[PDB]
Subunit: 98 residues, 2 copies
Amino acid sequence: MAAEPLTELEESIETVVTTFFTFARQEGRKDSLSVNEFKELVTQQLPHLLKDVGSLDEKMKSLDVNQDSELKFNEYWRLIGELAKEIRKKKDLKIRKK
Amino acid sequence: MAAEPLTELEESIETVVTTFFTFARQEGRKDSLSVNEFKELVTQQLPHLLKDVGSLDEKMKSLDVNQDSELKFNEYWRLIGELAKEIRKKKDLKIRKK
């Protein structure tokens, strides 16, 4: 249900935050996942291409440091930002390729 | 969720990158808006609560530096992440405020 003045931006954000809950049916969810875990999840969740250059390296070292650490939603954010900045959907990603 | 075999996580990312285009009409966008502009636009898009403390500071100065300048999706990402860090909607999201 909904009855709030949401807008597409808000909707994107509410989707992300709720998706930590609706991860793959996940009760007792804390914040986000673990850091390396996250890296392995995103490459799965994004089947599209994984061309990943530039921030690939940045993120790789960031995980390498202490991936044992928990990730948290705000940091997750930056990291998937970097992931978009890496894996740039050509236009119509849902096309798969053709 | 979609049909290539992409998951809800990736689903959110395509929605964000889309929504730069589906912002407020232009014949194909660049990367994001101007920094300051971006901050006001997200404020407008998120009427939800706007309690904004913590990353209010990080983000305020981050904008201030050269807030005029063109923002790109990379920076934008972190910044809306910080916005989630700030407005920690969490539970009472669709509950709005009143």
